Amino acid sequence: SGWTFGAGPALQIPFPMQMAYRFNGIGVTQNVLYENQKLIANQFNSAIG
Amino acid sequence: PAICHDGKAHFPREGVFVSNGTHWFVTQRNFYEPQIITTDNTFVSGNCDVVIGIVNNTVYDPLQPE
Ligand SMILES: *[C@@H]1O[C@H](CO)[C@@H](O)[C@H](O)[C@H]1NC(C)=O
Incomplete structure (x- = not known):
């Protein structure tokens, strides 16, 4: 869920895309x-x- | 993670590529607000084959209709 679960409801998101967020x-x-x-x-x- | 239109990958400038099962859309990180994938909100990089998860679509630009 990336960092979303630290801000509210946990939102599923593929891990290969999550690193693209972090880059x-x-x-x-x-x-x-x-x-x-x-x-x-x-x-x-x-x-x- | 991407869109391939003319043999070239297309990545979202600020957003992600989201589809409701029939049509694809690009929308903000934290608020669902679909928009048509044009060439101004997507920047091209790659060769349409290096990226995993490619999906075919059209990213048609406003310069062509006019
Ligand atoms: C996209 O179109 C090309 C050309 O027709 C095709 O070779 C390729 O397999 C298509 N992509 C997918 C995911 O099917």
């Missing part, structure tokens, strides 16, 4: 995420790993 909040447009989604997933998985 949009640091000056990086959505185009970076979707066209590099596979790479970013591997980096995040390894970091958690």
Whole structure:
């Protein structure tokens, strides 16, 4: 649900789109995420790993 | 996450692409207010195949009818 559940009723939203919201909040447009989604997933998985 | 019209992806400038099952719409983050997907509220980037979740649609611009 992203950050919506911290502001009211929890609103479902796909996770691949949620990161596009969060990139949009640091000056990086959505185009970076979707066209590099596979790479970013591997980096995040390894970091958690 | 996107719209492909002429072999090019299309991303929402400020909003998300929302469909009620038949027609697609772009609307604000926190208030449902659909608008027709034109070229001014969407910026093009990509090759229509790199993005996962592509859906075909029309993003027709106002410069063509006039
Ligand atoms: C969009 O149209 C192209 C050309 O007809 C087609 O190859 C492609 O499969 C379509 N997209 C989807 C999701 O079906």
